[PDB]
Ligand binder design. Structure first.
Ligand SMILES: O=c1ccn([C@H]2C[C@H](O)[C@@H](COP(=O)(O)NP(=O)(O)OP(=O)(O)O)O2)c(=O)[nH]1
Ligand SMILES: Nc1nc2c(ncn2[C@@H]2O[C@H](COP(=O)(O)O)[C@@H](O)[C@H]2O)c(=O)[nH]1
Ligand SMILES: Nc1nc2c(ncn2[C@@H]2O[C@H](COP(=O)(O)O)[C@@H](O)[C@H]2O)c(=O)[nH]1
Ligand SMILES: [Ca+2]
Ligand SMILES: [Ca+2]
Ligand SMILES: [Mg+2]
Lengths: 899, 901
DNA sequence: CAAGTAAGCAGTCCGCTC
DNA sequence: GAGCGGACTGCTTAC
DNA sequence: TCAAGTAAGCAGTCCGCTC
DNA sequence: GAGCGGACTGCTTAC
């Protein structure tokens, strides 16, 4: 045929590679291949051939008859103390050999399955490890069929019920409907069942015919998959359960972390990407709850499906709603992926690197595969992975700021610093050239230490690198970095475009039209800008949605390519990385420290010079690769009173940054490259934030409380001129998932008023929030914490020594729900709401905690509401942080007592 | 006399010390000890103080100890080394006791107590102490009395008083059989209520406050249970009266699998005898129950009783209390034998540490070295951080599995301490590095000479010869002190046979014991004056003779443990003097030395026997070579010998006169090659092994590394009346192997080595026939039980569940809902039995706590559904197949008609 | 489960000042 | 006795 | 298993492979 | 289904 072939899944099972793939005729195929791998040994110079290790030292290829021999050869070589070289993960070698080209994949041919089960349980949480309760609903969406297959148990030990009606389902809540979105109604294939055996046999047969390649859902890896597997195992036997693998192989793998161990089913020939796990790695959020209800609301702004009574009883109560719920749960994940596009990101990284798609969770595995593939094309031979001891190594510099208001601020930030350092210095395992005598870092920062080398590219940690060779790490990181730049470009264009539409919405023309057909990844032409100011509110609001969805797509693509390249840096400091080397890891961080503090000096020198001052500190702060510059003296040299409005002084500072500061900064960094004799100048420092108060207001513009704790009123970020000023808040309690939701909102308004409006406005809102606090929903004002090691501090159900406050809260909960089976149980390693309790409370302790994202069981709710300590809660979560902000910013959130 | 500390603690800025004063009276003092640490100087300010690298240091006296510790952090942040003893109570001890401490154990209050706690609802967790203490027995070393506290009334029993006369009687005369030697040492005290009992004991504790506190599980059970039980009634401050500094604290003991809690009683030294036993016994026991260790050590039986322990006090309060008393006595009997308390006192006072710190070689050795360096106005380096990582260890030759008829073994003397001294290894004696040939090239002496200037190890490390290392120096002094104190012990032995040959017909007179030193051979003056003494005054002179002997032994055992301890510390990141390159210099030097002298011995024997490239060295491990003597015996004829002693004499003569000089020459060449500071690779002949002359015995066999058996006639010049089996590694040696299978396999080996294949085949039949009639405990396997919970999946085995843990889960299901049923303890050991298919327990094995009978609830069913066939095959036949395969014989003449069925 | 370090605040324990 | 600060754990950010 | 070290054996589980 | 051996965990030696 005329289609390029690409793998779907791959496994090693003994001496066979089992591959699912799409063939030249674009059909799904499977094949068992007795892969003949090759490894490599350091040979003498005379025996030379086309194969050299990364240091250029020659190797002979050793072809093996099968894979189990190769692995044995490695163990034997490890006894002799001789290095066994090459790709020891044979299915990477196979993927590499079979697909010796850039893979173009067609996602319309990749079966992506999306499923959720319901298990009615009278006696608490149905543990998937023993699946002792009937499965009474499955919904399974298939991306090739674009259908929702619904499987519905009518008869179970916990009730006989009637068929679900798609007719009822479609309707609105009011006329007994379930509000199943109408755009999936014609995509639902319903199948009822008299017994569970029939339901399960039907789903397995169905699974044989529509075998997922990508399997996803919410908590599918930890609940649904193990629960279905063991439910089928317990009824029919193990052999029948293993039909969930198209190669009939499963492992009951033990996943370990620092607080215990859990069980997961590996289905060989399937790629499980649990969406909860994609969300945690790729979303760059930290959420107080990871329930689908909660993530659905945050991402889609779509509310919970309400239901009366406990989940354990919904089926008897309203099976019609039970089944609709199951169906929408599946849809929710598809909605979330449409927005975030984590499946597309996964496929993209998994095919770029030639790895199993689930290996996108592991940057070590992704990069091992990329660097392997890269070295193999040059007939070069990767090192044996070695054992190394974990030990600390130093990281970034963070300047101690003077706690203060800062009125006018411009920030600058190095482009992809650590990847840029890797490229600039030529930092690679095989580019190490030697070392030099290390002066103190201060001496390099101030340029009074002797030039390290006239021959080699240097870091100030004393490492020297060849300028005449290209390192594999520089080469391969450059490629991913360029992708990241391309996608960031699209993101910022989408961002700029959004503000134009936002601006056009202020004066919406009352007309009837349609959205304009544009690509949001590129700055609107003057022409399109003209046609936008003649649109209706309806048409503009649809275009704003399309822009923001384009920005989110850019954000996912760019920030996760940045994670991958930053994770190659990190991989250098991870003992399990093939190319682990603390000299190279600390070459990067130590260079970074010099670069930041070097450019701090250079910017101070330059601004003293423009402002006719001496030894003034203009750089008030920086962290890792950022500087924050006080612009007060720049504004004052013009005279604040000559500016027409805010956008006038913003324009001026924008021009000053670009035309005066950027050239000075590049001069500074070119001199630093020369001092270190680096391969390429790549220390590029873009203007980010222009921040200050609205002109003529008593806003303070910004404050720092200390390291990693500040707020700026931002008018322009990285060339995006905002319709309305945006708060950039880093580190403060507004940004922390542990801070109660209502208090996040309260503190942010406190900050907005401080920066924008000033002390009197702040003092006005403080009084306001104090008044409405005790009438706020109890969940909205509860603290959140992760609960680790509940058992370490559980001493016959009471706090042991050094018991953390949130753990105390959980022990208090556990005591109060003892011998109530249907009470919701706190899960080790998950998150809890926390409330303090007034002295004299019935729970016998000073706080209580319950599972985050839930109402507290009705058994105890009323007593909790009655004994909530509102005074301590307000003091701890609101007033204490606010006192931190206001002491920093040198104003008051209240006037003290006056008779 | 001279003043010695009892206990010491840092509480903030106050050292609290209990001590004996010059009058011999127990005292306390709080002290605001002003510590001193040290910093690096430029030459200008140099004074008497130098760090171990020589470089000069300023003393920095602090007002309190907390600013010294803060200064440390200040200095750390700065990246400046802060020299000297960070453990301030050691510096104090050093300052306060600047002389060899002479201690008097009759002035040290050693208490050991045991409590009983009647409980219906299973094990009474000490962390909650939710049941009445209904018995305590508390022996005091100074009073020589057992104080019995006996609760007469409780929620579980209103019972009568305990009769010391019914106690004394024999178990036939309705008695408890309480030893007669203690009956007149018991101070009984019944109580009508527990608060009364508890208050008195707390007040009795207040007079007679333990310095050394011991017992069996006192640390993990008895102490916390007494503490918390008193807290929970009388409140915290009252419970803190168990510290004589009213300062107590709850400690978090963390291991690889979870954590427990103990009560640190500040101002008491707790040496739980279970923990002393584990550390100092160098056994591995299938159980560490008092009852099991008592049986093993003393041969004293099992304190017996009917029904559960929860219903003993009610059923037979009279036996209950006797049990409680005899429990405490058992531990005294055990310490009478092993003397671990006295050894502990000796080492602590030697090192000038808390006595409880003898548990730690790192602490003990840090203190010893600090005190010596202080004396030379030198300054210990700061504790530094090092990444936990492996380093290479001993060499072990791969043996050819075979019978080996005639074997002679040679062992290097204290190898690792000797390499440290030989190569002068210390952090401050590191001088540089060299190009490293493969180890084989150093073994074969074809590698080029590392250095002409520095003492070398072949891991590439080079050391100054022109100075003595801190570590070498210190080890040499403890070596020298061992010799010192064994001399003293033997001189006091020889002096004690004099006095006991002057007691023959003692001059009936009125004299007084001579004021003599017993650590030296009596001058002929004293020998004369000793005969003209009375019986009284001789017998006192012999009591002092023998206490000089016991003290000499205690001290030299002490020194030996320290010598063998030190290498361990050197390999541990938390050791001040830890260096990785130093660790692997020690061990790689050891590898060379063994394989060097293997080459040398092979070369010499080939020359002596007129052969070439014959392998004489069949095996070696770390510090040992085993030499095949067959060809040596064949020079003279096997037939030419009169008896076994003749050829043993012959090999003893040949080793000492021929092989040892050849070995000394070998090791001398090696010393020059590595340019070492002194030659200390000394290799004594150890075993001579073979069959009885004219027998069909095979003499010995190897199955592999760390698995062999020798019939030994002579060890280090001691000629045995009867041959002794030296068995290493084999299942006879392993605590996991059933007691009865240990004995059977040993008799199998004995017959193989001494008698031959047919004798083996005769015994095999006999043990097979008797196996099914043996007691179930005697044929049960033993295993430690770690991570039970990990593999427990709703009461059933999880993935990769180990066999013994499957056994524990079977037991748990079987005793579920029986609260009075004995529970398996996480980290403790279990008996394991396989079960025949279709058994009611629902699995293929069961496990229960070791050193116990399995609970009567299930005992009958286990006995019925025991799989004897699987048991015999796994524990006995499979290992025997290993031995006989290696030795190239068979435990059966042929396969049975049944096996060919 | 899945690359890295720097560093903030909440809370416990405990000894010190007040 | 109350309040504080240092040494610590636990959690959660910023980069 | 609070409290020195590494080398290396066997029992048993999982699993592929061969009979 | 049983047996073997390799890759692993668990345990217990030797020194
Ligand atoms: O998760 C992270 C974030 C940052 N870092 C390090 C390396 C990286 O270069 C730097 C991040 O600084 P920024 O957050 O400003 N991002 P970066 O400079 O990489 O890229 P850019 O500024 O172009 O977005 O800190 C990590 O190692 N891991
Ligand atoms: N060049 C190279 N080939 C490797 C390495 N590890 C495994 N191989 C395998 O060795 C073979 C190389 O043969 P070639 O591609 O030159 O015909 C392929 O099967 C490839 O997967 C490695 O590190 N370098
Ligand atoms: N010599 C020495 N004394 C130390 C060291 N660490 C702490 N010290 C203490 O410093 C003081 C020195 O007093 P000196 O021995 O000079 O009379 C003593 O109290 C001693 O305990 C050390 O490393 N060397
Ligand atoms: Ca940056
Ligand atoms: Ca047959
Ligand atoms: Mg027989």
């Amino acid at each position: 045929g005329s289609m390029k072939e690409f793998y779907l899944t791959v496994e090693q099972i003994g001496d066979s590679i089992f591959e699912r793939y799409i063939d030249s005729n674009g059909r799904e195929r499977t094949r068992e291949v007795e892969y003949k791998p090759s490894l490599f040994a350091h040979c003498p110079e005379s025996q030379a051939t086309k194969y050299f290790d990364i240091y250029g030292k020659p190797c002979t290829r050793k072809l093996f008859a099968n894979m189990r021999d190769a692995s044995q050869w490695i163990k034997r070589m490890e006894d002799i103390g001789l290095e066994a070289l090459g790709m020891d993960d044979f299915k990477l070698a196979y993927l590499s050999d079979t697909y010796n080209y850039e893979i173009k994949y067609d996602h319309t041919k990749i079966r992506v399955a999306n499923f959720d089960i319901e298990v009615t349980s009278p006696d608490g949480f149905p543990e998937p490890s023993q699946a002792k309760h009937p499965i009474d609903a499955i919904t399974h969406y298939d991306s090739i069929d674009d259908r929702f297959y619904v499987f519905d148990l009518l008869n179970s030990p916990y009730g006989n019920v009637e068929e679900w009606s798609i007719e009822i389902a479609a309707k609105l809540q009011e006329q007994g409907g379930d509000e199943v979105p109408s755009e999936i109604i014609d995509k639902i294939i319903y199948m009822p069942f008299d017994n569970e055996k029939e339901l399960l046999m039907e789903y397995l047969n169905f699974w044989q015919q529509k075998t997922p390649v990508i399997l996803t859902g919410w908590n599918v890896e930890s609940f649904a998959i193990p629960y279905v597997y063991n439910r089928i195992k317990n009824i029919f036997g193990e052999s029948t359960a293993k039909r969930l693998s198209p190669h009939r192989k499963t492992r009951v793998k033990v996943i370990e972390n620092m607080y215990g161990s859990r069980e997961i089913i590996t289905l060989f020939g399937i790629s499980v990407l649990d969406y909860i796990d994609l969300y945690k790695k790729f979303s760059f959020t930290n959420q107080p709850s990871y329930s689908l209800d909660y993530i659905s609301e945050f991402e889609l702004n779509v509310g919970k499906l309400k239901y009366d009574g406990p989940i354990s009883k919904l089926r008897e109560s309203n099976h019609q709603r039970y089944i609709s719920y199951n169906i929408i749960a599946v849809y929710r994940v598809l909605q979330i992926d449409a927005k975030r596009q984590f499946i597309n990101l996964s496929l993209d990284m998994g095919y770029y690197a030639k790895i199993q798609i689930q290996s996108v969770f592991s940057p070590i595995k992704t990069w091992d595969a990329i660097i392997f593939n890269s070295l193999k094309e040059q007939n070069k031979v990767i090192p044996q992975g070695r054992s190394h001891p974990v030990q600390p190594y130093p990281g970034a510099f963070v300047k101690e700021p003077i706690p203060n208001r800062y009125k006018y601020v411009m920030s600058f930030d190095l482009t992809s610093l650590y990847p840029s350092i890797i490229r600039q210095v030529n930092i690679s395992p095989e580019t190490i050239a030697g070392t030099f005598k290390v002066a103190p870092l201060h001496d390099y920062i101030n340029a009074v230490a002797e030039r390290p080398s006239d021959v080699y590219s240097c870091s100030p940690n004393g490492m020297m690198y060849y300028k005449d060779r290209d390192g594999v790490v520089p080469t391969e990181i450059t490629k991913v970095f360029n992708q990241r730049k391309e996608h960031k470009g699209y993101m910022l264009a989408a961002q700029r475009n959004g503000e134009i539409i936002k601006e056009a919405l202020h004066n919406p023309n009352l007309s009837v039209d349609e959205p304009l057909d544009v690509d949001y990844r590129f700055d609107f032409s003057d022409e399109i800008k003209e046609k936008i100011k003649k649109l209706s509110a309806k048409s503009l609001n649809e275009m704003l949605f399309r822009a923001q969805r384009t920005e989110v797509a850019g954000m996912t693509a760019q920030i996760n390519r940045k994670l991958l390249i930053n994770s190659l840096y990190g991989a250098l400091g991870n003992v399990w990385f093939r190319y682990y080397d603390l000299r190279n890891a600390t070459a990067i961080t130590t260079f970074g420290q010099m670069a930041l503090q070097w450019i701090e000096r250079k910017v101070n020198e330059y601004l003293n010079e423009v402002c006719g001052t001496e030894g003034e500190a203009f750089v008030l702060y920086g962290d890792t690769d950022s500087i924050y510059v006080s612009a007060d003296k720049i504004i004052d040299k013009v005279g604040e009173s000559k500016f027409r409005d805010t956008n006038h002084w913003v324009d001026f500072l924008d021009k000053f940054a670009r035309e005066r500061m950027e050239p000075a900064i590049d001069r500074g960094f070119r001199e630093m490259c020369e001092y270190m004799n680096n391969k390429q100048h790549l220390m590029f420092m873009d203007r980010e934030a222009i921040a200050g108060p609205p002109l003529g207001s008593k806003g303070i513009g910004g404050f720092w409380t200390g390291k990693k704790r500040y707020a700026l009123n931002v008018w322009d970020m990285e060339g995006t001129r905002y319709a309305e000023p945006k708060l950039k808040i880093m580190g403060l309690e507004t940004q922390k998932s542990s801070t109660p939701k209502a208090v996040q909102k309260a503190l942010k308004e406190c900050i907005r008023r401080m920066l924008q409006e000033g002390e009197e406005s702040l003092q006005e809102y403080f009084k306001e929030f104090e008044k409405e606090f005790r009438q706020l929903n109890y969940i909205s004002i509860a603290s959140v914490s992760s609960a680790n090691n509940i058992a370490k501090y559980d001493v016959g159900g009471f706090p042991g020594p050094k018991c953390p406050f949130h753990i105390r809260g959980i022990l208090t909960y556990n005591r109060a729900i003892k011998g109530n089976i249907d009470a919701p149980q706190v899960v080790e390693g998950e998150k809890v709401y926390v409330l303090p309790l007034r002295e004299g409370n019935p729970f016998g302790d000073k706080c209580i905690a319950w599972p985050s994202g839930t109402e507290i069981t009705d058994l105890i709710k009323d007593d909790v509401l009655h004994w909530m300590d509102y005074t301590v809660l307000l003091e701890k979560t609101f007033i204490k942080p606010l006192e931190g902000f206001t002491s920093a910013a040198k104003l008051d959130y209240e006037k003290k007592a006056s008779l």
